[PDB]
Ligand binder design. Sequence first.
Ligand code: ATP
Ligand code: ATP
Ligand code: ATP
Ligand code: ATP
Ligand code: ATP
Ligand code: ADP
Ligand code: MG
Ligand code: MG
Ligand code: MG
Ligand code: MG
Ligand code: MG
Lengths: 297, 299, 293, 294, 236, 273
Amino acid sequence: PTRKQKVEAQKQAEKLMKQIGVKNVKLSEYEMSIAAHLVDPLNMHVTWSDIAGLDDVITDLKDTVILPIKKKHLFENSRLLQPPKGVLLYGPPGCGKTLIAKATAKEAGCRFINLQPSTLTDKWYGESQKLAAAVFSLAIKLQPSIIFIDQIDSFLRNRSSSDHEATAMMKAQFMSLWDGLDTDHSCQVIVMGATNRPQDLDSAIMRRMPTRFHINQPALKQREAILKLILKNENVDRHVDLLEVAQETDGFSGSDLKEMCRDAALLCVREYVIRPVQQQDLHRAIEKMKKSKDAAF
Amino acid sequence: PTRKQKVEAQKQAEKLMKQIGVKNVKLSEYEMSIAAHLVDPLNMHVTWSDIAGLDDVITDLKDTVILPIKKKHLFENSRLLQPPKGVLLYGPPGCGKTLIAKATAKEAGCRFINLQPSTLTDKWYGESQKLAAAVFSLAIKLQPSIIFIDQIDSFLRNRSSSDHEATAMMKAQFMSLWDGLDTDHSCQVIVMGATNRPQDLDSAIMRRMPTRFHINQPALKQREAILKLILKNENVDRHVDLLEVAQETDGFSGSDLKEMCRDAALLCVREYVNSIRPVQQQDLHRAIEKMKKSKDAAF
Amino acid sequence: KQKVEAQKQAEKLMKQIGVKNVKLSEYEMSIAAHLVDPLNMHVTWSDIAGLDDVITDLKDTVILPIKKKHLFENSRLLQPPKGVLLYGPPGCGKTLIAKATAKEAGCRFINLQPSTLTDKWYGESQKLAAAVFSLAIKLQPSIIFIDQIDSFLRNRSSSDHEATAMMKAQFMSLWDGLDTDHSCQVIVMGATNRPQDLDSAIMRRMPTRFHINQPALKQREAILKLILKNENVDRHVDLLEVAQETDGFSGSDLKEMCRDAALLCVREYIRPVQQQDLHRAIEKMKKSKDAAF
Amino acid sequence: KQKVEAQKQAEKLMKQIGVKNVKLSEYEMSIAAHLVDPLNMHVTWSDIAGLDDVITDLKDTVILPIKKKHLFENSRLLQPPKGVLLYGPPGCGKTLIAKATAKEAGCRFINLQPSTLTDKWYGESQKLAAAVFSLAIKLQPSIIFIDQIDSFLRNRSSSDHEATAMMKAQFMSLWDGLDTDHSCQVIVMGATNRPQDLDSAIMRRMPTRFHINQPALKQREAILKLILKNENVDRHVDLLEVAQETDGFSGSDLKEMCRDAALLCVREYVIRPVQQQDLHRAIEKMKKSKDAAF
Amino acid sequence: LSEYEMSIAAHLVDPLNMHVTWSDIAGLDDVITDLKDTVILPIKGVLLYGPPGCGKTLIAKATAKEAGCRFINLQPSTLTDKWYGESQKLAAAVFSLAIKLQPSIIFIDQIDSFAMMKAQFMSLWQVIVMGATNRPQDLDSAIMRRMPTRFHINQPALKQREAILKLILKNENVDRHVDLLEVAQETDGFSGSDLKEMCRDAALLCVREYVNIRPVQQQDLHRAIEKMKKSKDAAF
Amino acid sequence: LSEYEMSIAAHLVDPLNMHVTWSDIAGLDDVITDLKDTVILPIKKKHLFENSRLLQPPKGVLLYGPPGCGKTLIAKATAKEAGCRFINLQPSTLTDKWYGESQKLAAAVFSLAIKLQPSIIFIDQIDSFLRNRSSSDHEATAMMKAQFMSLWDGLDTDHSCQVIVMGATNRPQDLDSAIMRRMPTRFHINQPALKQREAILKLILKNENVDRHVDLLEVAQETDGFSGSDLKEMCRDAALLCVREYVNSIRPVQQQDLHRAIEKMKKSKDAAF
Ligand SMILES: Nc1ncnc2c1ncn2[C@@H]1O[C@H](COP(=O)(O)OP(=O)(O)OP(=O)(O)O)[C@@H](O)[C@H]1O
Ligand SMILES: Nc1ncnc2c1ncn2[C@@H]1O[C@H](COP(=O)(O)OP(=O)(O)OP(=O)(O)O)[C@@H](O)[C@H]1O
Ligand SMILES: Nc1ncnc2c1ncn2[C@@H]1O[C@H](COP(=O)(O)OP(=O)(O)OP(=O)(O)O)[C@@H](O)[C@H]1O
Ligand SMILES: Nc1ncnc2c1ncn2[C@@H]1O[C@H](COP(=O)(O)OP(=O)(O)OP(=O)(O)O)[C@@H](O)[C@H]1O
Ligand SMILES: Nc1ncnc2c1ncn2[C@@H]1O[C@H](COP(=O)(O)OP(=O)(O)OP(=O)(O)O)[C@@H](O)[C@H]1O
Ligand SMILES: Nc1ncnc2c1ncn2[C@@H]1O[C@H](COP(=O)(O)OP(=O)(O)O)[C@@H](O)[C@H]1O
Ligand SMILES: [Mg+2]
Ligand SMILES: [Mg+2]
Ligand SMILES: [Mg+2]
Ligand SMILES: [Mg+2]
Ligand SMILES: [Mg+2]
């Protein structure tokens, strides 16, 4: 009688299941365990507005994912007006991919679940395959839901003969149960995949996500917008030309700008020990971050 | 008394096997555990008509692998004219591999069973080999049946030193029970599988499936045909130059063309949902550009 | 209950194979169920073609110690081997030879089916492994067969279950150790696709090794002529011609090629093969043989 | 399984560190064995010289949010920086700065010891790495120190063991993934000797970046002053004079040369201070030995 | 011997069953002549490692009963049972039996392969235990100590190969002037069990020839050499 | 010492099993003298220097130079005449296929280092074991190297455990950057010169018979670029002629066979060129 950590995690999984609010569906062992990673929508504090700079991609994702979910009774007659199985957001590191994912987990219904591949792989034999199958069994049992695989470039890597038989069979069972013999028809089971290097993801799984949204490094206008958002609620001195700094931070990403502004606010509060930012601390922060960014060279 | 979850699998498999329709065959513990995976033909909504673009392959599969199951009155005389003990489909990912088997499950009127390799593996000691045995036992028990294994290569990979003793033992038991000592009398049992990396399948299991079908990457004409297939029920209007749009999408596979058409239809319905309109080759040709930009991402 | 089915099956088969009543208490009885009936499988030496010298050598070296044993009783060294191994490329007669031997060799044949040896319960595996050799000498002469011996008896390593590694020493000690190899005539023959990782110890217990090469031109011609025997093949067909073009082809591959030709002929629904449908099939396989490449 | 003795050992350690009661199932317990008690450390801010701007910025950025936290709960933008790392040439302070932060910042600083994560059994390493963040948020405010993070989290390449890729991917995901990045206050810090091939995403994961450099002329005089405070240095020994001769040397090799020159006074006794001459001879010999390699 | 000591004595092989003697160990007489002064002399562990075959279990079978007093072989399978892990009891009862018949040598074939009962056996550890294994690589750390003497039964060399070969043809008819030294020179990597099969194939070459009663004129020896050479080249 | 510490202690060399002493170390006597004051002396008078903070023994000593000339010898000598139980690491006996093993085996080494103080460690062919850090290599190798470095510098200062790692390399040109820093007290055991030939022939000829009138300066002059091991290897060719002269029937070498040997070894030395 080994592998009895399922009851301890199962207590919390049932607690969270009751918290979210579901019908009397009863998971047995493995999907019951995977239910532990279910994320409550209220916990997420990020809405659609918090994602700034890029709105075309946001509108596309909305109209192509959430719209099929809502008023689904108007699209079943059409054979191919259902949400695609697999949406993957790609691009350079950062730039709000995980932010978009967190936003979707709240303002989309479609009870959200994070996979966290670590939980799948297990020590005992023939125990990780059970979890891999339970993932989709759950996705279709408490339907409708969305699955998230953070950093999907490593877990579902490009298949090779060198990988362990267990992990290879795991990523093959994923493919089989995704759109295989018995699932394709209609289950509104859509996986959402974050990726910083989509080239090494796969060739088959690359197609299993027909919808790929590019998340590029913020440009001039995008940078200005994302910085305007960050300083929306914070206090700054008057007549601060926000656009002017966009040129100074030519190649900065979203998080780089966030840190640039945060370090300036911290410099202000340190000078206190409650002072409006005079935009000179911002320039000093840009100059200081330019050196740290040029770490490799 | 451990591993008593066989009660739920027993109930499920018994109900499914009674639904599919069979005689009072006796299956006790493990054949029952595997019987839970039987796929009922009525559930499948795809047929030979839904599969298009490839006709020669479809005709060859309809004549060589299924007609022997139908024309049993003609092959009891000839020993060399029995059906092949295994046929596999290989090629690039997509374009009907997992769909041809879905159509077969319905059309061939067999006792199609989806193996789902995951069910074979078990944490307890020795259960994997016994389930591997029960698989073929049931197969011969309710012949004529077809066993399907999606991603055969990932499951039945090349034999190496770095594999668990149970997995290798079960993989060798498959080889021994499929065509080894006691088999191939008639048994009408054919094991087919689908894969996209056939080169790493095995040194000899490839021979265990002598007949193999290659699903070519969609070329121009079959691409146009499969696209016209999808564009028959929708509200697509006339004067759509199907040939040109099909020629534009060169490297596209079948699922990629399906996604392109779906995205074009959704773009078209955006206009209505904002406030029911034909796709007059413009939104289609423009969504082709979006799908092209989306494809050129691994570089 | 497992033991009830064991009772039925092993009592039916043991009595059907014509062995005088012996006491197979619990586990020897359980393994007796795997006994193969000499009548069921029907593959004679004539079915084996191409490799005539190898099959003759096997026939002699294995049967003559068993049959005509009276001539060999006075000798202490000329007795049936305590181990045989038939390796080589896949297919091409290995399990075919194994099947044929089980019929025209006497020496009641018992397949091992390694799967049955494993058991989740404690102690069942080792007890079954011992009961195998117990039964083998209980009803001698007997042949033991382990298909894909390389996988079952894989190279000993650290990454193996304690019971699967205990049965290794069990087998090794009971095969030719302290209480065997006197007057038992228990020959253990095995077949394997890959001889690389068989063993270092078990490899020694199977000294006699008959290697069945990939059928060459003449052996390919012979094996191909063999298959086209019952069906209505059209005369004037040059088997040597197709043999020339089937260089890389294997035995089972040629079997499937003939099957495809015959099924193509039947598609024209009662025609004899006139070497043109054979050409179609061989062209198809030459185009497709490089499935990996 | 060896986690029974590991739990027994980590018991005395965790409870010894003045903790709030928490239950650790199996893995967070295994990682708790790496806690470093503040009293065990014997390094403070005063033990560091030559770089006062860098350590002042370090405190201003990391300790100012931690300490006097009652002034930042009203603002969502002023939180401690996640992933503060200190790069630069080998030696000269990095690990010593980490120890100083560990001792003089409280917040139950913990070392990672990346070797403990690797395990032969399948699924062990991936599930163990999550226990790190689990314990960290369990007993926050905490610090996770990836010593020599250059090797642990390298630039992701196509060819790598299935274990390491999943390991670093789960690291990045648990860092700032779906359910994280709030007032938990967890702050990782790494001390790499080479920032060339650390990562592309992990680099962004670390916004704050400190530059520990080879001590300059003034910094070298400062560290030389600090070195011989406990020792009885001679009178009229110009530390600035020897700082010039020791141009390229870093801090550690300078401490070495100092110990070597000091041992000579003992050699002459086996007990007088160093009158600026033994220092010169020792630094000459050490320069020759350093340039002897090439 | 109430319950378990009887279960163990059930494996008590008899001296009359043994069929080996010192002459049967041909060529490897130096190791067994060094033995007596080492082991047989004290009475009137001991582990024998080496390559697969070539006298290990042969040397174990010889001196087992003809020398010593009523020794017993364990064959660890005897320990593991179906019920709730009673092995420990047996593991103890075994040594109990050992004190009954002072002395009785204990044999453990393939000791390398041979949970809690394992530690109990290690702990309980009069006679010197004899453990024969094909690989001393990873036998154990604690077990290796209890066995201080380790006789390396090496792969027979040229002279040793010829010595072991001449024994196989002692009571079997062969041709005169057969160069045993030459055939031994031919076989380089052969073991004793392999020379056995080679000479047996050579003799069968004559038996069959008669079947279709004759000495071996070294032609069948050469044929068996050429055949077993390819036979050995299986893994490679 | 549960599992790994025992695996490493299995390499513990016994002091009495080393037949080398300082009297058997010639040609460079300044090096062994510096060894006394820089390394042995801290270990000596330990009751004296506990008060001194920065005068404790060193951690990491490196002896580089072209092959031979005593790189290998002094090590065992340092273990014999100074106590301080010594262990050779056998760098090749570290790596294994099993995942996560090498890391634990290595950590066990530095554990053995401290729980058996005062313990020296010797890393032969450190270049081979700890080759220059490279961006492109087996992740396991770089991980092991970084773990070794961290545990070396990790929690050793202020502990006064007296662990003095020592590494020898034929070429220090591309050893490392940080690892080289880890071994500060580099000892330049260097190719000796004409003066050393006498020293090397002394220890070898003292036991056997060699007639007088054999000018040591002559054997030093006939060869100028020979190493420490090369001079011993050359004396072999000469001694063998004299030894053989009797077998074809116990004689001293009258400075002549040395000439033939030096000539033959000059010819052989001219092999690559
Ligand atoms: N458009 C935006 N508006 C506001 N903040 C942003 C935006 N884009 C990025 N950020 C900042 O970046 C951080 C999120 O980083 P992000 O989720 O993009 O990392 P990531 O690269 O997606 O992670 P991973 O590598 O695991 O995919 C947040 O703290 C947020 O403040
Ligand atoms: N000829 C076709 N007609 C209609 N749809 C098609 C065709 N070929 C592919 N598709 C589309 O592709 C999808 C099925 O993908 P497919 O079965 O080809 O993947 P696969 O490569 O078989 O997967 P696996 O790698 O598991 O074998 C379906 O949704 C279907 O709409
Ligand atoms: N010499 C032959 N004569 C007739 N048929 C042959 C011959 N060799 C192979 N075959 C064909 O090959 C099939 C048998 O394959 P075979 O028994 O050689 O597989 P195997 O390689 O022994 O199996 P495994 O790989 O498990 O050892 C039969 O259907 C038979 O028609
Ligand atoms: N500013 C300083 N003040 C006092 N000691 C110093 C200073 N800089 C360097 N040292 C000396 O250097 C040694 C510490 O080395 P350091 O921590 O710089 O190694 P490191 O190269 O940072 O390690 P890693 O390679 O893992 O980053 C101490 O013994 C200390 O005496
Ligand atoms: N010196 C010898 N004289 C005669 N026969 C020998 C000799 N050495 C080996 N043999 C032959 O080898 C066979 C015995 O093999 P052996 O007892 O060496 O196996 P083993 O290696 O002990 O088994 P395990 O590997 O299980 O320990 C006998 O049949 C015998 O004929
Ligand atoms: N400069 C020297 N330092 C130490 N030993 C020397 C020196 N010159 C000659 N020797 C003698 O040479 C012997 C060691 O030979 P060595 O040069 O180490 O050969 P190898 O390099 O092949 O090991 C020692 O016994 C030592 O007495
Ligand atoms: Mg992210
Ligand atoms: Mg598919
Ligand atoms: Mg076979
Ligand atoms: Mg440091
Ligand atoms: Mg033996």
